[PDB]
Design a protein around this ligand. Structure first.
Ligand SMILES: NC(=O)c1ccc[n+]([C@@H]2O[C@H](COP(=O)([O-])OP(=O)(O)OC[C@H]3O[C@@H](n4cnc5c(N)ncnc54)[C@H](O)[C@@H]3O)[C@@H](O)[C@H]2O)c1
Ligand SMILES: NC(=O)c1ccc[n+]([C@@H]2O[C@H](COP(=O)([O-])OP(=O)(O)OC[C@H]3O[C@@H](n4cnc5c(N)ncnc54)[C@H](O)[C@@H]3O)[C@@H](O)[C@H]2O)c1
Ligand SMILES: NC(=O)c1ccc[n+]([C@@H]2O[C@H](COP(=O)([O-])OP(=O)(O)OC[C@H]3O[C@@H](n4cnc5c(N)ncnc54)[C@H](O)[C@@H]3O)[C@@H](O)[C@H]2O)c1
Ligand SMILES: NC(=O)c1ccc[n+]([C@@H]2O[C@H](COP(=O)([O-])OP(=O)(O)OC[C@H]3O[C@@H](n4cnc5c(N)ncnc54)[C@H](O)[C@@H]3O)[C@@H](O)[C@H]2O)c1
Ligand code: NA
Ligand code: NA
Lengths: 392, 392, 392, 392
């Protein structure tokens, strides 16, 4: 299958590419791949483990190997022998210039960038380049996945976001104020009849306009925002207090990280998308609102080794207060990268099975899952297993 | 309903009694009570929130109020106004002298004790006092729950434990070597047609002899070992790694506590029952065996404020190792005490609904649940909800 | 001796008062009192353990017992028997209405307040009430200590802060813009020839104008900002990396707390005083600047139980990076309150020994110590011991 | 200078060798070297940064490069380019067969070993091989440092350990029962007039017999047991509670590690040497005995990445209990290896300055420092600085 990655030179993107190749060459295990669990045996009938890659970027590098290597130098998150083994493969992956339209002040942290909008292109002209890029690469087994930097909250517009007609009128009118890069890539993917997933808390296809487009086109889509680390633990652990009839009175989540993701998320406007995603999970599992504080701060020495410190203050029998602490220490690209490959496979599977619109049953992968109130990790995994079984 | 508590003067026992009374008087909330979750509405039809208490003990105190107060002085785990409010009530609860037969070297840590066996009584004579004590208290809504100190592993015997006939032959023969206090209390309870639960990892009714007895008598029973803190987190969290196809390579669980439970568990023979319970959970959820280390050490300054430190070392994508730490800081009697009341209620419910034998669907309460391979906290809670629904 | 406490109804203030009385009555130990260490034996010759209290406040309560009780209800940070024992004593302590001039937006978090400036009083008129309040209480063994809410950074003024003449010209001119409450209380104390200490990071007497005043008057003064918890650990631990020739590349300090101090510090302008104090310590001990992030966030369930999470990322041999984490869990008023009594005693001692100006050798108590580059806790304690020895 | 390393193929030993070479070649910084702090400028006059290596071992490898590489494969604790750069250098370092006499049951965990005693050699014959090995390598700038596996407590003997005459009588009598490998290597080193240091808690030269020998020969010696991680933090932090007149009521230290050191220390007899060293530090800094629990458990996934979890329970003002937690996450060989080079340099310095007997002022490096009650890290560092200054 083919995967078009928006933000193709990112650490998550390049690790997914390195990882695909290393597994295909038989020099890495299948650990971390949800699609490789016994319950999903038979997936390879519709979505075998075989990947070709293309994508959009705004940072300037020659190919995905120079990109993967840049990240590897700072993080060393796979062995040099894996880097060497996948070199000629990744050297052949060359991203196309994309759009960073309305992607927030955090974008400046990426350094040297080139964009479609910086060429003077209108919305219609940008959509045409984006679509030409993708359609030149795409086949009948192609999926588009957004792993680009996190955008700020979009400028609100009922008219331009509320219906596909309104959104297409937005493009016709070149009303850039109400468009963001993530909507334009999603629009392009769905217009081309290609399954789409959003690994970020940027809007992407999560607006009614694009939800309507996906349904009309009969195209499956999924998101938003990878649930890889702290939020995974949060949606696994929070239910434990509810099952035991305890009240969570306070929940602190402090996340520190470096690298390009920490760098963009350090900006107050970009950060807001992520912070809301992380916070709002508690109410959806508990029914009520614990005093919740969630922060992300740049901490350059950690690079891609995002560390989270959580503190849960909870009441039990006779109103007595008690304390739980956790510290999560992992490489963000390690927990994220296989999920990209898993999502591509589940999207292709769903496409072949005639699924269209929001694949709500893919909630398990996401911190802000579209069209569902299933947030509990355990319930989500059951829903994913049962969905697949019902379609296999 | 009536509850006979073996280890009636313990901190868990006395807190359950204090808590029952405080709720009944309307000066405490219902927080911590699983039987009070919306899904279990209607339980009060069969098991209303109303408790009378008796029990067995070996430590010397006048009544359960002097006992509750002893623990309260060191822990202060409920307000003085709760202590005062429940005083005359608990003053009327007077334990009967029980047996500490083969309850391990840790028993010495309890200080001044008196026992049935120290009177020179045979197994048959001890069973008769135990049964006379219970039957004098019991009615048709009475349950027996063991919350006594944790015993060592029992002396192995196929003959005396393997069948009810063999066990009754053991008593007839006064073969004390193959009996423990927890089996004798369980035997007495089941012989009297009373539902029984074991909040400890002592054998209790978890031997084939007594399992056979419960079935024959048509009596429901449950256990073993309250899952209140570290083991709860372990059975909630471990599944998260499996769902994400990660390998747990190492799991450290270090528990430090004081008070009488830490004191008895400091003894190497008693400790073994608990350590096995805590450890064996991982394999049953994962399918394989992470390098697992579990320890309990006495630490007197903490008193009943058991603190656990856990460290999970795990592999993900491309074999990369990552780290998760947690620290649990709670009052053991706070997380345990409502479960005693919940168990009494669910046992009475099951009794009225014609349930008999091991109530495997009560696994949710226990670290070593009898007759089940359902260990996952989420699966256990679903099983408990579905069980109740199917019987309501 | 007598102690005038600015912010007399605060949790630190009222705990110091409760604590003084309880020790004097012989129902509490002397634990926590630096002035009670063997090395300071003989202090009682000049500053015996004997305290009378008065002070300024802006929150509305009848006396210091109602104030201490308000905090005790939420925190329970000493036993009810201590509360009862010190009741009639604290009932006789009645604060006088003070000034909250330019004390930042965080002041609004205190609820119902009354102030001198809200009466329409000029700077000269306010200074006269403040001075009349203090001088009516003061004797030849009286000290003034500021434990009021933390102020924002003051409005900068070379002219009005740079010399005593400029500062007195500020008052004559009623130029409120360049005055804050903490400077006015400090001015009043020093004008009255009374030793002064600032337990907060508010400016207080730490401006050249007031430093000049203290010298002229021959009066000892000390500050700023109690070093009680996270910053104490930081100044104890940081030196360990320097001694071992390791480079600290990153230091995260995250502090969460509730109660009135967390409430005022939640305001972005007030918070800035504290955050700078906490951060700048590293450079002064290390010679260089680790990437340092320090935050304080309100977290109401913790009340006065401030919890800090720190993360130290450090390089050693061959440039290899390593990790250290700590979690501090204490009651802020517990670590602060004895230091108030200690400071009063050391200030009276210094006064009797003819010390005047900044008592730099009291650095040990403070996170922003005036007139010194001694920050290391170990060096500070040696300096304090040697200072006292040289004057005893 | 030359350094003879007992346990030459260990991870600490081989990292010190790799590190020496990498610095000398100018491809690594001087971070981690105490001898490279500004205060020790001028050391290079007597002990320049220049190292040749030999040593004793019992595990079977061809040379120190194959040994360093074995550890590097599992730990990756320096870059492959460092490994490559120092290859031909380390290939030329070939250990001589040593003795593992009375080195405990933990020795079995090392796998395939060959020893002098396994040849049938008496004590006198073994001492002669050990001495011939060392004297063939040694010059006038040679030091012997023990970095071999930790031994159990020795068999007690006043006669054979109490005086040099008694110890030499032990050898003459071939009384192996009262000798251990570490005493024999130390004896050999001192008999040859060579400075000696013990990086382990094995006895080494810390018996009166050998202390007497070192004095007679006019030879400087140092130890015992590297203070690199948890014990360093403990001796840095404990003083903070004393300075503030707080009582430490409990201190938990839990250490988990893998690799050969964790493997040998997993044995109950070997472990005892280390556990006593770690524990006894508190009393020497505090004057009293907090309830202290210290454990070391094998945890193979961590390899040389020893992780410690500490919990400090402490009383302050009014007897209120408070909590401090730390987690130490480092590579043991990283914090240890430069100290080996530092110790060699300080020993050579002391030798040239006419120092003889126990160099008590090297306490700073050690968890069980010989001939001193200075345990506080801050006091130790001052003593080290002042010692050097007084001799430079
Ligand atoms: N565990 C995780 O790493 C994780 C978890 C949840 C969400 N996410 C989200 O996934 C995304 C990728 O994470 P990452 O660590 O790889 O970040 P990254 O910065 O390394 O990669 C993102 C890439 O996108 C490019 N980019 C930014 N805006 C673009 C645009 N408009 N069009 C095309 N390219 C653009 C950047 O130049 C960069 O190369 C981020 O949004 C992140 O917040 C990551
Ligand atoms: N969170 C928890 O507190 C928790 C969780 C799981 C299991 N448990 C188990 O529940 C039990 C109670 O815990 P606790 O903190 O109340 O301990 P506890 O020591 O305070 O109470 C146990 C009581 O049992 C009495 N006893 C001991 N052996 C007896 C015997 N053979 N017959 C009659 N009485 C006997 C003791 O004197 C004591 O009063 C322990 O076995 C404990 O390990 C507790
Ligand atoms: N461990 C610690 O508690 C600690 C450590 C370092 C610094 N401090 C500082 O000490 C101070 C007291 O801490 P706390 O917990 O008692 O806070 P608190 O809010 O309980 O007490 C401060 C009191 O000052 C009063 N106040 C505010 N502004 C005033 C003004 N201008 N004039 C007179 N009264 C005023 C408030 O009404 C309040 O009663 C705070 O500034 C705090 O940041 C505390
Ligand atoms: N941070 C630290 O690594 C640290 C801190 C304090 C103390 N120490 C001590 O330093 C020593 C070395 O630590 P390590 O991690 O390198 O352990 P290691 O096991 O890797 O190295 C020790 C070497 O000594 C050899 N050995 C054992 N007994 C011997 C004997 N009698 N004669 C000659 N060789 C022998 C072993 O084969 C091994 O190669 C251990 O005793 C350890 O406990 C280490
Ligand atoms: Na805690
Ligand atoms: Na870590």
């Amino acid at each position: 299958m083919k995967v078009w990655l928006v933000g193709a030179y990112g650490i998550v993107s390049t690790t997914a590419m390195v990882g695909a190749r290393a597994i295909e060459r038989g020099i890495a295990p299948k650990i971390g791949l949800v699609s490789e669990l016994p319950h999903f045996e038979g997936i390879e009938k519709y979505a075998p483990f075989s990947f070709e890659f293309g994508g959009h970027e705004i940072r300037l590098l020659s190919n995905a190997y120079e990109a993967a290597k840049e990240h590897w130098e700072l993080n060393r998150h796979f062995d040099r022998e894996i880097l060497e083994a996948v070199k000629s493969d990744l050297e052949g992956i060359v991203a196309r210039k994309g759009t960073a339209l309305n992607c927030g002040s955090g974008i400046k942290e990426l350094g040297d960038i080139k964009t479609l909008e910086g060429e003077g292109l209108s919305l219609a002209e940008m959509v045409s380049r984006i679509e030409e890029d993708i359609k030149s690469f795409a086949d009948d087994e192609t999926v588009v996945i957004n792993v680009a930097s996190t955008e700020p909250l979009p400028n609100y517009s009922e008219e331009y976001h509320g219906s596909l007609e309104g959104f297409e009128r937005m493009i016709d009118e070149d009303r850039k104020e109400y468009a963001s890069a993530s909507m334009l890539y999603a629009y392009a993917a769905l217009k081309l009849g290609l399954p789409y997933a959003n690994f970020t808390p940027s809007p992407g296809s999560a607006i009614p306009a694009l939800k309507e487009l996906a349904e009309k086109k009969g195209v499956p889509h999924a998101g938003n925002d990878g649930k890889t680390g702290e939020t995974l633990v949060k949606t696994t652990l929070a239910p434990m207090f509810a099952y035991r009839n305890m009240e969570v009175v306070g929940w602190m989540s402090y996340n520190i990280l470096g690298d390009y993701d920490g760098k963009v998320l350090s900006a107050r406007d970009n950060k807001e998308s992520k912070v809301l995603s992380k916070d709002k999970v508690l109410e959806k599992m508990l029914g009520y609102s614990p005093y919740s504080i969630t922060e992300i701060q740049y901490f350059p020495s950690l690079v891609d080794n995002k560390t989270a410190f959580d503190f849960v203050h909870f009441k039990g029998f006779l109103g007595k207060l008690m304390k739980f602490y956790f510290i999560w220490d992992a490489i963000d690209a390690i927990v994220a990268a296989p999920l990209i490959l898993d999502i591509a496979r589940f999207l292709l599977f769903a496409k072949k099975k005639g699924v269209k619109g929001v694949v709500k049953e893919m909630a398990f992968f996401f911190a802000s899952p579209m069209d569902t109130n299933v947030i509990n990790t355990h319930e989500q995994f059951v829903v994913l297993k049962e969905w697949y079984s019902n379609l296999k």
